[PDB]
Symmetry: C4
Subunit: 457 residues, 4 copies
């Protein structure tokens, strides 16, 4: 049993010297790294083109349908008078009706086919208000039924919509919905058959705040299909099958290795009888390899489905493939651990990790207290403290010396208004930055240095 | 006495093993953390809505009443000719008179009710100048009585104000004051009854510099009341009472513990007879808990008052609640100190603190000298050195590697003008940054490393 | 043999004490540093003037020929309607025809002389579309022959171009090509004879995306000649010859030293018989000196050619000269290594380097995995993750605490759209920044500290 | 002699214990710190008011006299057509003639009084061109006499200037000079008598590049006098005299101490007979005090002159006073050196300094080589590499982790143009940042840590 146990923990070189078995798994892992990286690169190259197409079409739509729109004004684009709102709505509808004659792109009208479009209708102009909405600020009185009533005009592609009358005092919002069909000719370069896009365009005039300011936004959804009857005067699926086969073989070999480890662990436990030490028979690198294989196979199946237009879950597929690629690239450290000089550094990090995590536990409570305090106190006055996630991002960036002066200057811009709040912000920011830069990061450095010193002895 | 003293310093686990008393205080502290955090989250969620309402209304007012106003131009918005100033004033008054027909919001006029509005007047247009203002720059002569005279026209909501004549050579400023009543319908979502807002709007055309440039600003004050006769087709006060009860119980238990410590200290002193060592009987964690309880109770009472519309001190309440939440979250380190691995890091920080503070004392004098020098020399030329607090913020950000290049480039933009000042700025910035980054932060790191090394032995 | 070997490794001071030979090479190296630096400074001063001339002319061309152009709008300048595109094209052509009467600069027309300009033609207005381009998005149908057909109108400098008809549905792009001749009178200051510039101006209206948005750009190529028949009412070539002679002498002496080292190494090997230890006879400083001499001589020849207008490879010459200057300035460390106090620090760096490089090897795989994952997942949503090189630059800047908050906020701006992607971005950014700042840089610091500690003992 | 020598090196406490002499110098230094700081604060408060006045007047002038000017466009403000230039010039002159009726400020015209204004002339409109300027880019020919001829029209304050004819092909520049008199009424607040300003306004249309782009700028010079015949319906000079007296007394006492040290050193040398060890008798703190006293006295005299309007050298006075304040605040470290715990840290820094400076010497050559290489190679393409001082500022900010990503992205914006330059920039930036952050700063930290470790033993 001793010999088998010793050989089980032997390094690949020692195993080859002893039994001479060819290291199939190492070569398979190298090939897997290569093919997985190539597949990810190809997928990203293909997807960025579609992303660019959709983004450019959306920018063109914003310039076409939004009155007085200019680049970089998405956040602040709003209406402030009834005349402005009416003009914007009518401009959007008129530009929809004039699209064939003015647009640089080639778009087709989509009629009916569901809701909110009635049969034969291309554009739906809906206004949503309250069922009952009596409001009298002069007498501090109101009577509202929060139930929302929707009223839509239907415009067929080529003017009753010009008779629109908005109930401003009880208006919840206004929306314009339509769809445009186009063909992605940009696919010709990069050697792909053009596909058919349907853009669902929604223009929203939002009055949910009732603050006298109605923001205006335009959004698009892209539905991609294979064009019927294509006409233009295989190395994508074979590569996917190759990747799947490589991952399956790697999974089988790693599962065999893990089973062998489990059986040897059981034998050793039985021998000793006649948990931390049990899991010594577990090869975490092979767990990582199995996880990467599963993720890659799932992502490859999803990618095959997507590229045939049968699926539209690009986010999940991209996440799976990227995570698997990261895992396979991280797995290369196993090979470096077999050399003493590199193993020194890897073991330094490994022995540092536990105390680092314990110190993270110690620091998290202070960090969270600061987050809550900053959100509650500075949230009203600071744009960077409006949400707890935003507060955490701001504090994390401050800890690393980024955007410090702008954070100070935002509060400086309102020193005269509230002196108490300004003094509190001064104390809060100074104390947090000093504590976390001059004491916490220093202790991280000290922990790493101590781990390195221990490893070198 | 020895046994009682030993038990007094026993850890909670040892105390439970010895006497078996249930650790009520620990459970109470956990519950306190939970309820305090939930209360803070709810309060912040509620307050951000009102902040958004006020900010949006103010932006709408700026777009409505300021002629030629655009987003992001608040700091530089100014008039430069008499025609521009007259046009801006008349535009503001005309937009006030046309508000019902043009505004997307629903506003009500407020008449009279104090000063500067006479009875029946909604808008007050005041101009403030000097009593006697003879100025003759041609002869380098002037005769001024600094006493300020105010002259206001009163406009009743629906044109004598069109006859306004400004005394430009002796004008101190022009102001427009009015009030608008609105109802916050946005409260319907989040399940709250709408409240009644009164916005006091002040538009200022400022000529205190007499520099030929008159900045224009708009400011609002919000007074919030409960709307009389509400009509819309309890889990906020019960939670506050629960929080107050929890904090009061924690305060009572901590006071009992502190009294026991005081009595035991007195007994030990008497025994020894028959300050640093005396305060060893003081449990600073319980002082922190008592402080947090007091702050939380005060903030909860203020919050109860505010949410009934009887109080308007949001800043003080928010500061109290945020500070108490920070304190209760920092108090969790006490529980970690009972475990050796975490106590190692906590004790490292504790033993590092004194030398860190002494080095801060050493560094403060150099920092202050640099602050004064930079303010006096670069203040005239650098926007970031205009005020001592701004100088301190800039230097602190520089020490942490933020906004360095913009600071250098601002001076670069005027190298040709004054070569001496540019050379001085070069020497000043380079020396300060080098000294504080390569020697001071390094010494902080060394102090922390030495403390950690001592603790590990 | 022992005495000769000992003298070969003697320091310059010891060699002078022993044999008394004048250290010609040291003085030559000092003179080389001086002359090389002066030459580089003069070359850069001369080149920046031409760079400024070309840049200013290009800005003037953009303001002259692009309709509605404003500074800082190069990236977003685009057309969105057929009317806008026609107006821009006609404005460019009309401004070309009116240049003599409106331009502040003095330009001459260039006619014919190649392609795309026919004989006697100054401006070429080409439109490129597809040979066959049937597109019917209504029926999801298309019939395209990807072959590109070009049709150009020729405009002679002083209106058939006004009859231009664009094939929008199959348009690939539109281009306007012309050339302008000018004289660089700015050369008079700095005491140079004015030279003759020919600017080849290309205006591109790009429709390769077929997205309804056609970006517009202007680019120029400068061809510089010596003006024929100059008339204006030697210390540049003599200095170049001096530099070349100094570099050649340094090369000869260093080659002699390297040959002596090789011969002594051969003698020692023969004696011992009767690789790491062999290369001990190689003086890497002299290899650096020889490389710098070769680079400087090549760059000086290229510079001589350029300044006579016989060459136009400014990038290669600048790279050669800058690299050689960097090498000669780095070579000064050799002289500092002869003093114990400075040699301590230099040897610290030298002994730290190998473990630093090994740790870089360990870290590269994790860095690459993160790069690929971020590119594939965040590329569609983040402007800073569009390309792998851009991803690497962003991650490298993040590791050093730059642009952290903007990176977080770009993803924050789309939290509601995709919650899964936002959560993944949170985990990705937080884990990467924490791992690389609190563990990797700490280990670099620890490696350097250990090297320094070993050197001091 | 031994007793006197021992007493000479005694600490202030030991000296007081031994001889009982009252420590007059310590109290004097404390009073000096207080009074010098108060004086600096008052001077800065007074000066930034005048700075604000001048800046506001200049902004008003830019808005009045520059056609189409908007805030934040100073750098890019330029003309591109002859029509634009004529319109700008005529607008400036017309606005000068209409100033009394349109300006919000009160200004007086200044006539004649030197050059370029003839007797009775308020505005001078000069155009500078070449004596002979034949330019024929068509034939690549030119004949220039670089002598500059100036031709000015004179406009008396209330239209021959409308007949201006510009020689565009040989124009060097156009300038408009005039002067305006105003009274600074803003001085009334802060309790000062208003003073009389004369603004010399120069508007420049610059054509020295001959690039078809003529930048337009406005500059002002302020000359300040005491207004004659002031009329408005001493604690500044007494404080200055107090400061001067305090500094003089401190100087006398420190000189006495230094003379005593010199005499004792001479006695010791004579005794031993019967440089590094000699200068042990020099008290560098007293040298610092003497320098600060001299600087403060000089700055106070200059400030007295300035505040009486007899001097205008604000930069020199501010530099002197700021440097003296920095020195006196740095001098406080002497008192901290008398306490062991603070002396530990101060001595750590003192013993670290020499090796830090030697390592700076080692690093300077690499830094300079990188500076030259970056300037020569990236200068043509990168806005941040245009000048060697700018290159140094950019590299220094990069070393400290500031503005990294923008530096990378500026080069990314031109990857396609020159691939060789882009690759070189990648290698250059990556190598520089890595070398200086992961090896140089680490060695600074290691040096400080070693110094601290040695001091603690
Ligand atoms: C076209 C490519 C075909 C490749 C596969 C066939 C050709 C080929 O070389 O296979 C090598 C593999 C082993 O490949 P591989 O896993 O690399 O080889 C094993 C590992 O080196 C293992 O050590 P660790 O790597 O540290 O765990 C070691 O203990 C085993 O020795 P032992 O056998 O004496 O105990 C080796 O056999 O051996 C098979 O017998 C395949 C059975 C697969 C069953 C999967 C489902 C359970
Ligand atoms: C106008 C300026 C003229 C300058 C040159 C003439 C005037 C002049 O001082 O020359 C000094 C040089 C040597 O100049 P240099 O190289 O500085 O001198 C040698 C180096 O010091 C070398 O040590 P390292 O520097 O550490 O390698 C040392 O071993 C040699 O001793 P050794 O001779 O006893 O072995 C020295 O002769 O000696 C010549 O004989 C020139 C032959 C050149 C052949 C080149 C083609 C192979
Ligand atoms: C209104 C305020 C008036 C203040 C001054 C008068 C009232 C007053 O206390 O003077 C204290 C000073 C000394 O003031 P101060 O300099 O503080 O006192 C001396 C220092 O403590 C010195 O040590 P260091 O400080 O380490 O150098 C020490 O060796 C001397 O002892 P010794 O005398 O036994 O050698 C002290 O006399 O003694 C005078 O006799 C003034 C002579 C000035 C001559 C200047 C021109 C050369
Ligand atoms: C001259 O250079 C160095 C002198 C001393 C120490 C390190 C380096 N550098 C070598 C090059 N290196 C790569 C730059 C391009 C991206 C990939 C980088 N490699 S990396 O290992 O992923 C890595 C990443 C971040 C931090 C450290 C290491 C940077 C470090
Ligand atoms: C050999 C088993 C333990 C090695 C560590 C597990 C993999 C680490 C993942 C980063
Ligand atoms: C146990 C008494 C001393 C513990 C320290 C006091 C509380 C620390 C507050 C951060
Ligand atoms: C003396 C031979 C080895 C010295 C090192 C080689 C030159 C270093 C280049 C930076
Ligand atoms: C006591 C003499 C030496 C003390 C150092 C000199 C003053 C340091 C200036 C920063
Ligand atoms: C020893 C008691 C630990 C308590 C953890 C909250």
């Amino acid at each position: 049993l001793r010999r088998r146990l010793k050989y089980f923990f032997m390094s690949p070189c020692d195993k080859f010297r002893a039994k001479g078995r060819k290291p199939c798994k190492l070569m398979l892992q190298v090939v897997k790294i290569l093919v997985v990286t190539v597949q990810l690169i190809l997928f990203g190259l293909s997807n960025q083109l579609a992303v660019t197409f959709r983004e450019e079409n959306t920018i063109a739509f914003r310039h076409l349908f939004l009155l007085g729109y200019s680049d970089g004004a998405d956040d602040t684009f709003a209406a402030y008078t009834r005349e402005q709102l009416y003009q914007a709505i009518f401009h959007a509808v008129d530009q929809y009706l004039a699209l064939p004659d003015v647009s640089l792109g080639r778009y087709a009208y989509v009629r009916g086919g569901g809701d909110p479009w009635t049969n034969g209708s291309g554009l739906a102009l809906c206004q949503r208000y309250y069922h009952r909405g009596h409001v009298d600020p002069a007498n501090d009185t109101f009577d509202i039924d929060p139930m929302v009533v929707t009223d839509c005009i239907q415009v067929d592609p080529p003017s009753s919509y010009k008779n629109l009358t908005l109930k401003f005092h009880k208006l919840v919002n206004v929306t314009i919905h339509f769809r445009l069909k186009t063909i992605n000719l940009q696919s010709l370069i990069n050697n792909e058959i053009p596909d058919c896009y349907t853009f669902s365009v929604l223009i929203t005039f939002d009055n949910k705040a009732h603050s006298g300011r109605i923001p205006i936004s335009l959004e698009t959804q892209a539905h991609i299909q294979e064009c019927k009857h294509p006409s233009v005067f295989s190395f994508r699926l074979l590569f996917d099958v190759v990747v799947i086969l490589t991952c399956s073989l790697s999974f089988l070999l790693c599962a065999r290795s893990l089973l062998r480890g489990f059986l040897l662990q059981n034998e050793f436990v039985g021998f000793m009888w006649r948990l931390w030490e049990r899991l010594e028979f577990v090869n975490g690198w092979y767990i990582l390899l199995v996880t990467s294989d599963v993720l890659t196979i799932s992502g490859t199946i999803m990618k095959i489905g997507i590229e045939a237009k049968n699926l539209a879950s690009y986010d999940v597929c991209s996440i799976l493939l990227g995570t698997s690629t990261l895992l396979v690239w991280v797995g290369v450290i196993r090979y470096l651990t077999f050399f003493h000089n590199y193993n020194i550094l890897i073991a330094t990090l490994r022995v540092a990790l536990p105390s680092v995590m314990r110190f993270c536990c110690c620091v998290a409570v202070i960090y969270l207290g600061y987050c809550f305090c900053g959100w509650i106190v500075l949230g009203p006055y600071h744009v960077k403290f409006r949400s707890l996630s935003m507060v955490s991002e701001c504090l994390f960036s401050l800890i690393n010396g980024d955007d410090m002066f702008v954070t100070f200057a935002a509060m400086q811009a309102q020193q005269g208004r509230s002196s108490l709040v300004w003094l509190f912000s001064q104390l809060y920011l100074y104390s947090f930055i000093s504590l976390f830069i001059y004491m916490v990061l220093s202790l991280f450095i000290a922990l790493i240095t101590g781990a390195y010193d221990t490893i070198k002895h």
